[PDB]
Ligand binder design. Structure first.
Ligand SMILES: CCCC(=O)SCC[N+](C)(C)C
Ligand SMILES: CCCC(=O)SCC[N+](C)(C)C
Lengths: 534, 536
């Protein structure tokens, strides 16, 4: 028995496993329960803290993935399967993972907490791209990641009901956060320095914790990668959640909220997932059925209302986008688009893809979108039409929501740093036309290219090392700049006036001004006026 | 008594004329100024279509310019060259229907291509007698026969009670058409070729050219057309029958005239100056680049809207040259936008910008106006007074001239025409307008007419070489339907404008440069989106 691999936490003893990382050993503690399994009558309910255990709990292995839809668009294809569940599916999934340096850090170390994405309908802390070993070994970080409930199980709401109050997947995340405060010191973590970070739905989750008071006493800094609490996909109204939950209940034969929810509890997990996608009001892409709900509790108003009116003066935020946020999503519903060809579309196909990409758009607003993204020098060129369709989806769903958030936080006294991620991995299996798709910066931030067996280039290892530094420098200090290394250019803070951000690629940092400024004025200032008059 | 210059005595349908031998840098030219082409439209003939001039006896002296048509005279900056050069330079009178002819001296032996000029001035002003419209240089250097006519403006030209007999509308256009008929019958007496006639005009002159293209009885009177900074389509060049009736009866009320016969009869008893004094009071909004009395869609001269006629016409047999200057709008800003002046740099605020947009785009609802503002803001420096000043100029420029031109070039090209497109980018060294105004509306004209060739005018040597170039493009086009010099292969070519390639050339001191797309992105907003936005 290795004594470095034994830890006493409040609920009892744990045994971890020593992992090798290219530069040396790390301690992993995998599959630690942080809550009572949310099963049977506990389905749809706020999580309860895990009861203590006797003896030494085996924490050498990943636990089950929360029950979720499994992707079947391209069976066997690495570019999709890499996001699919890599352990067994179970409703019993409230577990977290901790990586630390080996030996256990002598003094308290900044803690990074990862929250995965998956549109609130999927994800798992156990995926290869979320491997905490590299950041633990190189930067000396304590990395934590949790499972949280997705789809119906995490976000089905009958607002105002005691038995399905909404947002329980966020409350799972909150409980893991409280677990870190109570327990991370035992691992050599510093509970007084906790940085949240996430991508996509995970970034929106981080944003929601910023906007929810009881969560604010559990972290100090935040990183939001390609996702925001504001925007078209991240929240629903109470009225709209009620509709979807009762619609899903009709689809599975149920049944007075008590009656309805009691009947939903008798249903096998897969019965619920089977119909999960049949409750959306429109034919759409980048929209998900069960997401955080504006309940007047976890979220006391809309993310929009809360970001305009908040005080973020003692807050540091790192925020950014990848180069081609929307390309990924096009193949999941827009006619004319596939990974197996060049996807050169017609104008007809472009107009029709806009209605699906902006499902809430009226006739007028859609043509405003089309007219705005057309190249009037080459109105019918199939390459521009394809790239523009990709741009429509990325801008509406990520880039412009991100620009809006960055501006509001900076204005409201926060310290903001912004980026665009432009390097496409040499090992990427998606076609070239997709460029740098939603999700493909994660493997670099986590430092995977340092594994020589993964076949990344030498340049990409040096790059991964740069990014791992910006991220942990940010966690340590609230500033991603190397505090003892000189060299201009420095990464400047994002401000509403200058709007400075940096590009992250193989070349040294470049400072740019204005994050799709003209285009986002269309989505953030004009389009709302056009809909609030139809 | 037969001691006068044998080369200055010419006979026309109406009788004998005596012209004058003028001096031009390269040699003498022949000028026949103030030839009457219509009965004077006075008294019971006010508002009425023109009647052909009745023949005179003996030799009519045609050695001086005639009266300028009664009109509003500019008083914004009195004594200032920038405005005075456009002001009337002869007595104002309703007796004003005269044309002018310039020809080589001696008159050419072989039939010579004819250029006809139609002046601008918003349909409320202008005169063929102004220094910038001097035909002597095109006549001497290019051997051209040049003709310019006076036509009625303001109320006298365009006040209309549509449907009536006594004031049918578009009579100023009918003056222009009568002078075109006069050229057909008479120009051969001067050595001109009636079978090669090219119309050309700037601003409202350009729009007039365009209306002659769209009006059937005019089409047989000319062969080629040049439209400078103006178009028959767009927001200012025409009005509906209903709106023209509205403006006419309002004018009547304001001057003491409270059945159309009765109302027109009372209008005809008012002094000319009273009508002018009240002209501007009938505009529906506070505005710039809008004029009270313009061509009307009467179902007669214009069988439908200019917009409809360019969309459905067959233009296979048409050659057209069209273009714009670099800063079409800047001129108009000092005549009504709070914040703007010729005597300072006119740096403005956001508030002043939004306020100016309501004036510059007077027909816009609140939604459309924020569309304009949001589109023209630079969101990296949304409060920079220099950018805001320039965007304001661009808004008015784009909406009134540049995008109507782009629509015109596109529709004619799609409908079979041969179109050549330019942007004129050279600021005259002699300009008295402040630098911020760039190259304003109207300041290519002096170059096309070759004024820099006159040494007493203080233009630079490069400006002479440049004026000579443009005179060649313009007259090659008149001659052949093609601006390019058949000999010169080394010189860069001017390609036709098409829908697929959208090619046009820059006109400056440097050799021709081909650019693609005529404010394509921005003009898509004005021509495609805005209409659809105003339809709700
Ligand atoms: C270049 C156009 C000049 C005018 O609009 S004149 C109008 C001036 N006023 C309204 C005072 C009569
Ligand atoms: C006072 C010099 C400014 C100019 O060059 S005026 C033309 C403005 N703009 C270049 C924006 C069209």
């Amino acid at each position: 028995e290795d004594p470095q691999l034994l830890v006493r936490v409040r609920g009892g003893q744990l045994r971890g496993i020593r992992l090798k990382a290219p530069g040396g050993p790390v301690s992993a503690f995998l599959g630690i329960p942080f809550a009572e399994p949310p099963v049977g009558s506990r389905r749809f309910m706020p999580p309860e803290p895990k009861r203590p255990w006797s003896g030494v709990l085996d924490a050498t292995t990943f636990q089950n993935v929360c029950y979720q839809y499994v992707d079947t668009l391209y069976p066997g294809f690495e570019g999709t399967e890499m996001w699919n569940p890599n352990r067994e599916l179970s409703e019993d999934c409230l577990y977290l993972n901790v990586w630390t340096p080996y030996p256990r850090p002598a003094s308290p170390t900044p803690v990074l907490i990862w929250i995965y994405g998956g549109g609130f309908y999927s994800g798992a802390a156990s995926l290869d791209v979320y491997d905490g070993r590299f950041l633990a070994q190189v930067e000396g970080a304590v990395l934590v990641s949790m499972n949280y409930r997705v789809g119906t199980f995490g976000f089905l709401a009958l607002p105002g009901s005691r038995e399905a109050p909404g947002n329980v997947g966020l409350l799972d995340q909150r409980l893991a956060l409280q677990w870190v405060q109570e327990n991370i010191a035992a691992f050599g973590g510093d509970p007084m320095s906790v940085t949240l970070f996430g991508e996509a739905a995970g970034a929106a989750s981080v944003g929601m914790h910023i906007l929810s008071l009881p969560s604010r006493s559990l972290f100090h800094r935040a990183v939001l990668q390609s996702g925001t609490p504001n925007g078209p996909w991240a929240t629903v109204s109470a009225g709209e959640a009620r509709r979807r939950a009762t619609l899903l209940a009709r689809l599975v034969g149920c049944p007075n909220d008590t009656e309805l929810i009691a009947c939903l509890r008798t249903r096998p997990a897969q019965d619920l997932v089977d119909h999960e996608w049949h409750v959306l009001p429109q034919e759409s892409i980048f929209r998900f059925s069960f997401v955080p709900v504006v309940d007047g509790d976890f979220l006391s108003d809309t993310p929009e209302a809360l970001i305009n009116t908040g005080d973020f003066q003692d807050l540091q935020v790192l925020v950014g986008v990848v180069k081609d946020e929307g390309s990924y999503f096009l193949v999941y519903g827009v006619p004319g688009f596939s990974k197996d060809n060049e996807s050169l579309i017609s104008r007809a196909q472009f107009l029709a893809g806009v209605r699906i990409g902006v499902p809430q758009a009226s006739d007028l607003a859609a043509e405003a979108v089309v007219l705005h993204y057309t190249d009037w020098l080459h109105p019918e060129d199939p390459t521009h039409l394809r790239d523009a369709m990709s741009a429509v989806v990325g801008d509406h769903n990520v880039v412009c929501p991100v620009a809006q958030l960055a501006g509001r936080l900076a204005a409201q006294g926060a310290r903001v740093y912004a980026y665009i991620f432009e390097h496409r991995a040499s090992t990427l299996t998606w076609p070239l036309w997709m460029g740098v798709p939603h999700g493909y910066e994660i493997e670099f931030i986590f430092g995977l290219p340092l594994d020589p067996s993964l076949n990344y280039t030498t340049e990409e290892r040096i790059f991964a090392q740069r990014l791992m530094k910006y991220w942990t420098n940010f966690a340590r200090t609230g500033d991603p700049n190397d505090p003892r290394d000189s060299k201009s250019p420095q990464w400047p803070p994002y401000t509403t006036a200058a709007q400075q951000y940096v590009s992250l690629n193989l070349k040294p940092l470049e400072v740019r001004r204005g994050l799709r400024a003209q285009t986002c004025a269309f989505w953030n200032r004009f389009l709302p006026k056009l809909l609030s008059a139809t």
